[PDB]
Design a binder for this molecule. Structure first.
Ligand SMILES: CC(=O)N[C@@H]1[C@@H](O)[C@H](O[C@@H]2O[C@H](CO)[C@@H](O[C@@H]3O[C@H](CO)[C@@H](O[C@H]4O[C@H](CO)[C@@H](O)[C@H](O)[C@H]4NC(C)=O)[C@H](O)[C@H]3NC(C)=O)[C@H](O)[C@H]2NC(C)=O)[C@@H](CO)O[C@H]1O
Ligand SMILES: *[C@@H]1O[C@H](CO)[C@@H](O[C@@H]2O[C@H](CO)[C@@H](O)[C@H](O)[C@H]2NC(C)=O)[C@H](O)[C@H]1NC(C)=O
Length: 362
């Protein structure tokens, strides 16, 4: 199975033990590591961070002792702006310039492929997205025609039904992509005004779901039936949780909230907590297993956070294997306990290793 893991270039700036650099990654942990994110300037793919060239090398160095490890560079990301991506993909000239600039850039920096993270095409860009993927793959095939190891092309896609229906032509793009990472998390925003797990495996209590489509199982099934081959589908599993600030004594699923949770010490983003930060949070907290959804939430004081742990990722892997999917995708390596000192056990990347062991099990 494929174990696609993301590394974010901004995790380096986190205070203390939160700072994560590529060299802190286990070269034998994943089968694919994706660097996030590359920018696009003057219609050319380009670096984002001032020291990306250095970090690129730091990441690719991992391949020296592990020749089977593949690496990809992701372009886009939530903070990229679908608007900019649209202008480039819709304009015939800009699209060509961009596509042509990718192979040289990837070979120059030691990458094995490109990951498209356009979040997200609009109803207006559905076809453009298809064309972009189709032509990019063409260029990759051409660039390797002489006899090179062809560059890989993947895409991180939304797991939301509304976005999927308006942005993607699953059947068409599935043919050109080497693999699709479905982002099966972020299913329950603080805006919804109630507590909810952002990455449940199944819908669960039919009574307590704000919507039947907001769960991992529905997204996987839906995409499969839309025409994405199981052998090309990689299921996303989060190593971070979504938090809320409770508004009353109620602490169950669907309880009243006043907004996102208090920012984590290292990630410093209201509504988000890295797994290592959750392990701290767990001290003195109560953990509940959501029956039906197969995932846990933890609550303490006026805080509540839905996340994934060793037990739940194991179940999710069991699920993807039963569905004969290509494997799992992890977002992100730097949100797992990479130091291995927060969740005790001294084990590094506890959630990602749990996923790896589960994929090899049976
Ligand atoms: C079911 C449904 O459609 N719900 C909608 C939500 O999907 C949507 O929320 C966005 O969901 C995206 C995935 O579909 C998120 O993008 C990926 O996932 C991570 C984590 O959420 C993103 O965030 C990371 O990267 C940004 C920079 O780009 C960084 O600033 C953040 O700190 C970082 N977050 C964490 C915790 O690591 C990535 O950009 C991206 N990764 C990949 C694989 O490409 C997106 O972040 C998320 N938006 C937000 C801000 O929550 C919401 C949006 O309103 O709408 C629902 O309807
Ligand atoms: C990614 O590339 C874009 C170029 O397309 C950069 O955006 C430009 O930023 C400068 C300075 O902030 C502005 O003067 C330009 O108007 C922007 N170009 C436009 C119109 O898109 C962007 O800064 C790059 N990202 C990073 C952080 O390096």
């Amino acid at each position: 199975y494929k174990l696609v893991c993301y590394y974010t270039s901004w995790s380096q700036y986190r205070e203390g033990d939160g700072s994560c650099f590529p060299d802190a990654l286990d070269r034998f942990l994943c089968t694919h590591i994706i660097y996030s994110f590359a920018n696009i300037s003057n219609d050319h793919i380009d670096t984002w961070e001032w020291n990306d060239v250095t970090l690129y090398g730091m990441l690719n160095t991992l391949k020296n002792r592990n020749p089977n490890l593949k690496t990809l560079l992701s372009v886009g990301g939530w903070n990229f702006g679908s608007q900019r991506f649209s202008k480039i993909a819709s304009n015939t000239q800009s699209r060509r310039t961009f596509i042509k600039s990718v192979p040289p850039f990837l070979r120059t920096h030691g990458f094995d492929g490109l990951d498209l993270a356009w979040l997200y095409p609009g109803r207006r860009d559905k076809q453009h997205f298809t064309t972009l993927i189709k032509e990019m793959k063409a260029e990759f095939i051409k660039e390797a025609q002489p006899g090179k190891k062809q560059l890989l092309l993947s895409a991180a896609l939304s797991a939301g039904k509304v976005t999927i229906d308006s942005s993607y032509d699953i059947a068409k793009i599935s043919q050109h992509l080497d693999f699709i990472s479905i982002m099966t998390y972020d299913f329950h925003g603080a805006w919804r005004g109630t507590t909810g797990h952002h990455s449940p495996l199944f819908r669960g209590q039919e009574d307590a779901s704000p919507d039947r489509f907001s769960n991992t199982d529905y997204a996987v099934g839906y995409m499969l039936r839309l025409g994405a081959p199981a052998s090309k589908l990689v299921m996303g599993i989060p190593t971070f949780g979504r938090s809320f600030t409770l508004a009353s004594s109620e602490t169950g699923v669907g309880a009243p909230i006043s907004g996102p949770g208090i920012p984590g010490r290292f990630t410093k983003e209201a509504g988000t907590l890295a797994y290592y930060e959750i392990c701290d949070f767990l001290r003195g907290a109560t953990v509940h297993r959501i029956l039906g959804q197969q995932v846990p939430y933890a609550t303490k004081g006026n805080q509540w956070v839905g996340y994934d742990d060793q037990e739940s990722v194991k179940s999710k892997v069991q699920y993807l294997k039963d569905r004969q999917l290509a494997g799992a995708m992890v977002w992100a390596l730097d949100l797992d306990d990479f130091q291995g000192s927060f969740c005790g056990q001294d084990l590094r990347f506890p959630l990602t290793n749990a996923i790896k062991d589960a994929l090899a099990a049976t």
